[PDB]
Amino acid sequence: XXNXXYX
């Protein structure tokens, strides 16, 4: 990944 969140 590499992006973040949270969903």
Ligand SMILES: *[C@@H]1O[C@H](CO)[C@@H](O)[C@H](O)[C@H]1O[C@H]1C[C@](C)(N)[C@H](O)[C@H](C)O1
């Ligand atoms: C998510 O990123 C922030 C910014 O670098 C960190 O401070 C944080 O500790 C990090 O969360 C960890 C723990 C978690 C939420 N269980 C996940 O594994 C994420 C990817 O990494």
Ligand SMILES: [Zn+2]
């Ligand atoms: Zn991931």
